[PDB]
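> Could you send the leghemoglobin (nitrogen monoxy) prediction when you get a chance?

Sure thing. Input:
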Amino acid sequence: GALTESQAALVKSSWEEFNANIPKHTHRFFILVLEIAPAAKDLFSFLKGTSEVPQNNPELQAHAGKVFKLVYEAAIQLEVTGVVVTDATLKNLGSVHVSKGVADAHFPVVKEAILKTIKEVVGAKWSEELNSAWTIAYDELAIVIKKEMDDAA
Ligand code: HEM
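Output:
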């Protein structure tokens, strides 16, 4: 709907399971990115000039771990305040994405790689409600990001 408390619980819950195996889950996210849009590889500094996604890279792990953390925090924020607040960081994030060649048409790619990751993290605990909670948070965070991008360009 607009993030109920049982929806926020599920995001936090699946988020903690994700965090439990960063090496594994973060490698798996970039696999799902590249399965969707193989052309995206080149945008990523730690993937460029590599054949396969690295499995024990600290840069990949740090990046993909931050990404998930910000969707999960966006979802708590929506639950609690009703909105996503734009701060310096999301302003900062807009200029970096503009610097790296990210367009609005790229957002659906990372959104589906994140849904598929989480589905594999929770396994049998997956529900259509968890799915809609991550969807809402991602979508609300991208809208903020996208305008900070559109203001940087
Ligand atoms: C809400 C959705 C997204 C979130 C929360 C987000 C978050 C981030 C963050 C936190 C970083 C590192 C920022 C820094 O400290 O420099 C970053 C970098 C990056 N992101 Fe995203 N991102 C999102 C969507 C996307 C999309 C759709 C793409 C395009 C395929 C993308 C591509 C990149 C690239 C190319 C970098 C630079 C990382 C590097 O090359 O080292 N992002 N993103």
